[PDB]
């Protein structure tokens, strides 16, 4: 049999929506079954970019392993990795977040320029995902990331995009008037993926080294 | 007033189903449907919707006027192409009546710069939008320029807009997004638009005089 998720969709599974188990990962599958538009998916409001393409890349997989690409405790010594929690992603009653992403916050009164990189040494294409937070007010921007005019840049041999966050009051969705966009890419072996941000970045904690197959879809 | 199966956003933006209505000139509250089918026909997120909901709750004088005439306000751009399948009207593509989706004119989208002074003796409600194309192909096809910007500025408002090109999940056969903003222009103030693309200009504005209190039903 291939995969199966149940209460969650692919988005909630790949991101680590704390309501779906993140660890029932079979090493291989031919197709995927799920509820596409699901209750538990992207808990913090926003849009998943290139989401339909990511579903096809994850439809048929021969080898699938998750690994802590950026260790939470050691990768971010000048930023706060323990304060990134929201009521839109609840768990056992308290607030929670995605198991595979870390919402970085300034440490004290400073958010120094972040620059982290990973080289693909797993021998296969690694699936890397990251988010971009768009606060609701400039007060949130100063309280989370200190700096006012920030930017995020993600660079690799097969990808390049610079992110400018927009501070605006979006309609209240799941008790959040700000938005967070989710992005993903595939890093070929030997290629180096780079992250460069002065704020608003939702860094990855777990990546996915994988080997894809041809065809398949979603049921 | 009571606006049937439309919402505030679709009514103030002028969704094709809400339709150009004569409407009243004064009201104390607004009767909406819990969930309305015709809101924003092109996908997006209405910024400060709750703020605008309360400002429009009680109005004593309400008069809509063509702030930027569709015919002569945009000579250097194309004002008669901005229709979409996400905003259909009777089996054909359409758009909001109060907004104009400006597109390049040939192989050039010159720098846009339009202004309006409020000579109506009362605060005027202006609304506009920034289109975020799905792919770089649409960015070149619609506005020619790759790296664009929008700047909306008055004496009580100042913000620059940087469109982001990305493939959002398909909604109403659209993978791009379009946000909608709005500001009030005090009498005597001058609102100024400056953009090189991705700007959904205003066609009809609303000179109004508000009242205190009220909400939505």
């Amino acid at each position: 049999a291939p995969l199966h998720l149940g209460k969650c969709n692919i988005a909630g599974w790949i991101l680590g929506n704390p309501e779906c188990e993140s660890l029932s990962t079979a090493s291989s599958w031919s197709y995927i079954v799920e509820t596409p538009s699901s209750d538990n998916g992207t808990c913090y409001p926003g849009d998943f970019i290139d989401y339909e393409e990511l579903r096809e890349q994850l439809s048929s997989v021969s080898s699938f392993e998750r690994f802590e690409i950026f260790p939470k405790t050691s990768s971010w010594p000048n930023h706060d990795s323990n304060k990134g929690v929201t009521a839109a992603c609840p768990h056992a009653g308290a607030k929670s977040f995605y198991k595979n992403l870390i919402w970085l916050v300034k440490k004290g009164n400073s958010y120094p320029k972040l620059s982290k990189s990973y080289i693909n040494d797993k021998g296969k294409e690694v699936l890397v995902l990251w988010g971009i937070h768009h606060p609701s007010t400039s007060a949130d921007q100063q309280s989370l990331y200190q700096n006012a005019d920030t930017y995020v840049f993600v660079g690799s041999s097969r990808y390049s995009k610079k992110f400018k966050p927009e501070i605006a009051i979006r309609p209240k969705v799941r008790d959040q008037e700000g938005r967070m966009n989710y992005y993903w890419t595939l890093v070929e072996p030997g290629d180096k993926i780079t992250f460069e941000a002065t704020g608003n970045l939702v860094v990855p904690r777990y990546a996915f080294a994988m080997e894809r197959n041809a065809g398949s879809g979603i049921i | 007033l009571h606006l049937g199966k439309c919402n505030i956003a679709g009514w103030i933006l002028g969704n094709p189903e809400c339709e150009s209505l004569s409407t009243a000139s004064s009201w104390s509250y607004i009767v909406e449907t819990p969930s309305s089918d015709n809101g924003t026909c092109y996908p997006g997120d209405f910024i400060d919707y709750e703020e605008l909901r309360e400002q429009l709750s009680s109005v004593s004088s309400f008069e809509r006027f063509e702030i930027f005439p569709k015919t002569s306000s945009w000579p250097n751009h194309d004002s008669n192409k901005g229709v979409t399948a996400a905003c259909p009207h009777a089996g054909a593509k359409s758009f909001y009546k109060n907004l104009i989706w400006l597109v390049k004119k040939g192989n050039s989208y010159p720098k846009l710069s339009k202004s309006y002074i409020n000579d109506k003796g009362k605060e005027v409600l202006v609304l506009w939008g920034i289109h975020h194309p799905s792919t770089s192909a649409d960015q070149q096809s619609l506005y020619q320029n790759a790296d664009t910007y929008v700047f909306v500025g008055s004496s009580r408002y100042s913000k620059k807009f940087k469109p982001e090109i990305a493939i959002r999940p398909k909604v109403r056969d659209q993978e791009g997004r379009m946000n909608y903003y709005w500001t009030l222009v005090e009498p005597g103030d001058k609102i100024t638009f400056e953009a090189t693309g991705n700007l959904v200009v205003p066609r009809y504005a609303f000179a109004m005089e508000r009242n205190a209190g009220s909400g939505i039903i």
Partner: antibody, heavy 122, light 107 residues
Framework: QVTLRESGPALVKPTQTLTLTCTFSGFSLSTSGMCLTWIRRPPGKALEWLALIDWDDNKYYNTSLRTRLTISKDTSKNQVVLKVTDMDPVDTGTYYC??????????????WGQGTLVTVSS | SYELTQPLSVSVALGQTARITCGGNNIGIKNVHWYQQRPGQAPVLVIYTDINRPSGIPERFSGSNSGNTATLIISKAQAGDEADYFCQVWDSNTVVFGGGTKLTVLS
């Protein structure tokens, strides 16, 4: 300035495999919303679409001819390849290489290559 | 699949207005593109997404789309307008071409 050129007029024997190479310039295939397409026109006959490849290496095919078609992009240099297995005399005609621009605007073809003549004969 | 239907041939007097139709079920909400193929040459896009005219295409080329019928309008029909015209949509991850219409200029 965009330039699309096909790879040489061909003579293919029946049941053999045709291989067409499209070289392009003036734009990058990795740009969002850029695709390359093979469209043929036989004598008489309306336009017939074959295969398409987009900026993310995804591949779409004429579903009536899926088993015979294979499209791919050369990892080196700006080139696209189309392989059509066991050709029939009905597969004779001009094969065009054209860029397809994709977006919420529709999926259209501009520009087109000058076309190459493929003749299936013994 | 999705059916696009054009007439086989359309004829118009010189200097008049030609109208080539492209039928489709609820085609008014779909993005239609028109391509011109003069005898012996490659196709060229003359009208994309219903009404838009690319650069260099003469002004007499126009297009409309509503209901179940798309239409390519060529005012002041010239002798050089004799060609084959094909409507096309990208629908359900598949190109869809119309049968094509040979336009002849009478007189």
């Amino acid at each position: 300035q965009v330039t699309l050129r096909e790879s040489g007029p061909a003579l293919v024997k029946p049941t053999q495999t045709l291989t067409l190479t499209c070289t392009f310039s003036g734009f990058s295939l990795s740009t969002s919303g850029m695709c390359l397409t093979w469209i043929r026109r036989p004598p008489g006959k309306a336009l017939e679409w074959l295969a398409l490849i987009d900026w993310d290496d995804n591949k779409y095919y004429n579903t009536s001819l899926r088993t015979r078609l294979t499209i791919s992009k050369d990892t080196s240099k700006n080139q696209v390849v189309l392989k059509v297995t066991d050709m029939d005399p009905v597969d004779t005609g001009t094969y065009y290489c054209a860029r397809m621009l994709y977006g919420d605007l529709g999926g259209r073809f501009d520009p087109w290559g000058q076309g190459t003549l493929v003749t299936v004969s013994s | 699949s999705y059916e696009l239907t054009q007439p086989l041939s359309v004829s118009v007097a010189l200097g008049q207005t030609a109208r080539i139709t492209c039928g489709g079920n609820n085609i008014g909400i779909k993005n239609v593109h028109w391509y011109q193929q003069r005898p012996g040459q490659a196709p060229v896009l003359v009208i994309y997404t219903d009404i838009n005219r690319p650069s260099g295409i003469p002004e007499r080329f126009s297009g409309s789309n509503s209901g179940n019928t798309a239409t390519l309008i060529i005012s002041k029909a010239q002798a050089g307008d004799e060609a084959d015209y094909f409507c096309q949509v990208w629908d359900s991850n598949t190109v869809v071409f119309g049968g094509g219409t040979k336009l002849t200029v009478l007189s």
